Design a protein around this ligand. Structure first.
Ligand SMILES: [K+]
Ligand SMILES: [K+]
Ligand SMILES: [K+]
Ligand SMILES: [K+]
Lengths: 455, 448, 448, 455
């Protein structure tokens, strides 16, 4: 039911293995904030799947062949050729990571006063749109806002919401559609191919451009092969290629599904926009021949993008996450459903029902998780939501969760068992989890540097 | 019950994942001999734990700092200090691998006509002893020859057999005692510290030298910490250091428990013997300052030897092997017991209790293992014996260190368990071709 | 007179070595624009010293120890401590490269309508300043605009021009002073410590902030040790530390003097400005704990920054550049003087004193350079200026660090010297295609 | 006249750069024996060209793709295929280095009482022959014994000496001919192709086998292309292939001309001997699929062997040595001539004519060289020659030299200038070089651990 790793371990990373009492000391000096823990003090780090992937022996061989030239690097040509072959786009501009490509796209395809619509948003993506004068509109289907609703392709765009938006505001004032695969805010939920072709059908009639946020497109491709009828016989690469046939371009973070620790790029088919793309990249990232990346990183990303297409790799990747979610749900632990492609979200509101949201249950759960197991997770509740500095009070989101984000090819099933067994043990005594009070709170981005103490 | 890996995966190795029909095609072209399979056609390669380990990021950092000088390399100085600190021997001579150290030891401590006794033997170790005029004598306890007997420290030396050997042959005709930790032939079985301390007591009374075959000494140390009373609070390093205090020297294959892919060394305390060791190393291995090893490999071995001392690494290593054995034993699959530190041995006699030993049950089982799952194993029965009929007819599933996961063990076990349920289908093979010596490597077969 | 490399070659990079007729074929398909040549078709690539350096074995060891965590990475802690120790600034924010730090600084220290003054400018630095509403004002000494004038510390700021700027415009409309070390536009020219100390004296009296463009600060430090009285006994590290004591912060491109292939950072002492710096870095570069850099790159940069402090490394780096200039100057080849720390600038005006500036003498010289020798150089004349007629029409031979030998410089010089003896044959080129902005990168040409 | 390096520096190795007074302190604590110096205390280490080479980026990429399997490694198949393609031999057995292959060859092709003849000898080669019951006979041309004689192909075998040996002793008692390329004892002197075909012509008539000691065959191949008429248009690989067409097998040390830091192999065409070769390799080196080498080393050696065939690489390699010899000879410094392919030999007898050989002039010159420049060289005179323990007195060789052995792709011309300028400066004050007395002398192999003090 769950496949073994379709690879061997080539090299390993040393970890501390400090005891529970030491982990408590480390958590106390970190202010009970997992963001302040030192990497060296962590057994299993589920803070993010961004840039934390394990590369292959082929990629590290490519790392030894870094053509570090300012222009005309062989590594760029290999990256360019790979992206044009697997994604099908005409032009590609490398960036140091995905948000670098998003900064370029927002300045190239947005006129001040226009609208941008897409299946929910991301923190950096929404900023570059809003910073450049756009107004974001969420047009995802309403089911994406139900955490417990176990349905497929929860990240599809509602065609009615898109159709109504075009009528009420006009197509000329619509910059583009930002279709993300997968949808991080709904929990890593996929978008069906049928939804993608419908979006292309509707936008093409009004001359409206479509751009993909393809950072986790391979995970999305696997869900299409597994759960959408008519794609069971098609390979991952074939599905990936067809997805992008319904887009005018894309922004990619290689730090995710390209199986590297740094890198991204920007794709598009329009020649004139690509000409302008090369003008802006020199002032933000670098020359269009390297774009803020060392040659060896372009090589590793080009190799990793080809490795991500292996069906066995992506099946194991998703099912390793599914294994963690299934073990938690089989014990009664409340999670967001369905389990996404890259992370399992613990519902801290139900986990810590004896605590109010003002006592930061997700933050206190994450601190308890690390002390019991050595596992770092991310608070994704009231603390991360921040304040509205105009009113001064907290922001209160519907989701008060703890995110267990699985880097690619870094951990085994036995590591997932360590995570699950500690959380399941925590759940059986969940009444002991204590609330936290702010001791230090910074002015902005409090999730990173704030400190707490038990109540 | 079984601990997770005390490390993260830093980089992975790509594998083929070829289907069953291809694996059968690959096995046919290999002549049904697992030794003839290509590495690229193998999902899980359990042929040996020699040199197949996965190194750490610290070791690969050391690999970038190869001081490749012919003499005075910093990497040699690191290795020398590390061995002198962890093992306690005065002198160390690096060799390209363990059998390189064995060639040196046999030529230095053996007079033609003398005897060498020890807890069973190894192929290259016994060869160099016999090459230099010695006669091997097995003095292991008799229980080590019963595969199913589940007792602790099965590799201990019988002191009565050793005492009788001294009387029947005389101490002067005894070159040395070759004490192996662990005992590979008995299934990876450990030697207790009490047996090591007792053997030193008896040999020292007759001026008999003792040399350890320390290739898997760390696995041995963990068994002492786990099963021998008086060592629960002592660290792996403390136990390893105490082990070697009862020996005049050792031969080490770093490819085993030093967590490297090449390398070994020879340790000793005698100054004159070390002086002669440096004379012999230049004509067989290389300068005593590098001994047939690159500087980066000496660095990797020094770091890996220190990493092996971490309790959690060595506990996980052994329990991953135990996990495979326990899953097979809980399904009724016949194995040699107790499970050793580095391998699980399938009892081909019981597994194929319908084919004669002349039908190559271990060899046919190993070929059948690969086609059903993609797992390479080693025949350890009549074919390896070359002396036609050994008591042990086994198939060895040897686990490299830090290379595979529990999910990989599950693939191995679940495939073998399904195979055992149809053990009547496993048939003997045709012999075909045999070389004069070491027939296991190049023989070829066909189904009947 | 010229010192040997204070290092050994650890690994080499394979090069093509294609003949002259192929190089001509390669140049024709490149449109006679050196920017359009493929790396694989180039023997000696002197296009830039940005990100083309060769790392050491210590740095590559650090590359194997990439702690790739999103927060709390050991590599960040190493980089932070190293910069705080060598530069003396309180806070550091890593960026993927120098212009990344410039984007942060310009948005944090510039009010729309204010002025920024400094010793000449850089393309990305001046852009981000103008992007945020500033107006650039060049306050370098006038001598820096004469290519042939051989004087020391040609990059010093004119204090009179700075004093007049304060009076004519007011200090409140001055965002900060952008002091670059070294000055790339003037030919890699250094700034004396006395000028740095004097500029801080004048700015501090009016509350004017000072920020350094420290991308080549180590080359600058060596010139202070070599040519400024009072610093002969002081170390490179001591000089670097004293340099930054006269600044409120700095932007660093590690791709230059930190001996790495990617990376940069932003330093400052103000706590509130650093607090805002961390808010802006997440939307442009990444978390303040990694800032768009892999952990292994932060490690490489921390090690490389410390390696750059070795006197023998930095002396050899500069004197290898000087060796190229001296060999060309001794043959009569016209260059900008004095030779800078990272590049030799061929004076295309004197080299082609028969072609007009509209015939692209620098661009035609650069294309001619490659076909005769296989050396890529950068046009630094009218085409890069995009503002049609600059005073300097030069060709830049930029030396990566630790990549080439004196024998490589000889190939460059001997080929250029032979070319100069036939400078009448170098002809102008056809313009063909120009993009709206930054025309140097994609223009194409043909011989007349 | 001297070509620049046909490669760029990809990565560098840190060195100490300690001053002259420190180097004197280091030399004193080393007992004035260069063999006892620490590698970290040396700027330019010219002790040997064995295993000290700098690998390429391609090789280090191959190092990341180590297939470490006990049997059937892809790296072995790549090594096997490369050797069969470039050398033309049917069978190959990897060994940890050349002397490992020589141990195998001596036990396979020598019956006790037989003779082995070849163009001079090497220390490890002669031992394995003599240890296995053979009697060595030097059949090199007499010109190889004249140090100052500047002639080409000084390492050719004298056909008369070979013809006379066959008549006086009989072919059945001749094990094989050991033709070494190049000849290390004569100073790295090459063997012509015409000499090789003549040796094959004479031996084949008597059924006498021929085996090459091809450790520096590429350097030998370059001399054939440069100095033997009729080979100016042929490539290095073509010349290498033709050389081995006149041999039944070879022993190779990859640590030399294969541009690696470890490795060797044994080649042959006889099937039955190869069957026996695989039996002996398991007890001395390892399985015939790896032979005492890690998979990554077999890969680096296979890649390096292909790189060694590039004409520009080998031309630069030889001419960098020639540059050092020419600079020394142009200043009057006495050297062995002609300059060999891998090293320059200083004639210490002429350099230190005020010292007798019992005062160890070569050893004292080497110590003075390091203190003045930071350059390690090897004494190749009375100290290395050792004693005859039967009589007790020293051995006294005709050659009292200091060997400056150049590793491949490690140093530049400026490093050669450092070597030459220091030695030339030493020569101008050569009367100051003082003799040394033994303070500690070991029983055997005194060159490695003996210590001295000035007289
Ligand atoms: K990362
Ligand atoms: K191996
Ligand atoms: K670069
Ligand atoms: K070496």
């Amino acid at each position: 039911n769950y496949p073994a790793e379709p690879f061997r371990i080539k090299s390993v990373e040393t970890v501390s293995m400090i005891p529970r009492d030491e982990r408590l000391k480390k958590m106390q000096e970190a202010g009970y904030n997992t963001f302040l823990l030192n990497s060296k003090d962590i057994y299993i780090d589920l803070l993010t799947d961004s840039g934390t992937n394990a590369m292959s022996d082929k990629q590290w061989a490519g790392m030894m062949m870094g053509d570090e030239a300012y222009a005309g690097s062989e590594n760029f040509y290999h990256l360019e050729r790979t992206v044009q072959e697997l994604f099908g786009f005409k032009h590609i501009v490398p960036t140091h990571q995905g948000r670098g490509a998003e900064n370029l796209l927002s300045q190239l395809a947005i006129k001040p006063g226009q609208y941008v619509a897409g299946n929910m948003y991301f923190t950096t993506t929404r900023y570059h749109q809003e910073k450049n004068g756009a107004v974001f509109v969420d047009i995802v289907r309403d089911e994406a806002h139900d955490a417990g609703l176990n349905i497929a392709f929860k990240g599809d765009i509602d065609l009615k919401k898109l159709q109504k938006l075009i009528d009420e505001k006009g197509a000329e004032n619509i910059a583009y559609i930002c279709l993300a695969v997968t949808v991080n805010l709904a929990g890593g939920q996929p978008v069906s191919m049928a939804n993608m072709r419908a979006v292309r059908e509707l936008t093409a009639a009004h001359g409206i451009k479509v751009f993909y946020d393809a950072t986790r497109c391979v995970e999305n491709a696997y869900f299409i092969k597994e759960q959408e009828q008519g794609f069971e016989n098609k390979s991952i690469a074939e599905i990936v290629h067809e997805m992008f046939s319904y887009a005018d371009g894309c922004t990619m973070s290689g730090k995710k599904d390209c199986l590297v620790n740094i890198g991204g790029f920007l794709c598009m088919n329009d020649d004139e926009m690509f000409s302008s793309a090369k003008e802006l990249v020199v002032v933000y990232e670098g020359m269009p021949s390297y774009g803020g990346l060392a040659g060896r990183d372009m090589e590793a990303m080009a190799i990793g993008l080809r490795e991500a297409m292996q069906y066995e790799y992506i099946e194991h990747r998703v099912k390793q996450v599914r294994y963690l979610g299934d073990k938690l749900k089989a014990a009664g632990v409340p999670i967001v459903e369905p389990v996404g492609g890259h992370a399992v979200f613990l519902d801290a509101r139900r986990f810590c029902e004896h605590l109010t949201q003002d006592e930061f249950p997700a933050q206190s759960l994450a601190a308890s998780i690390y002390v019991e197991t050595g596992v770092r997770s991310m608070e994704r509740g009231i603390i991360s939501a921040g304040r509205n500095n105009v009113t001064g009070e907290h922001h209160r989101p519907k989701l008060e969760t703890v995110r267990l984000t699985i880097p690619r090819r870094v951990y085994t099933y036995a590591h997932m068992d360590v995570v699950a067994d500690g959380i399941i043990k925590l759940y059986q005594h969940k009444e002991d989890i204590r609330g936290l009070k702010f001791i230090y709170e910074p002015k902005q981005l409090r999730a990173f540097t704030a400190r707490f103490d038990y109540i």
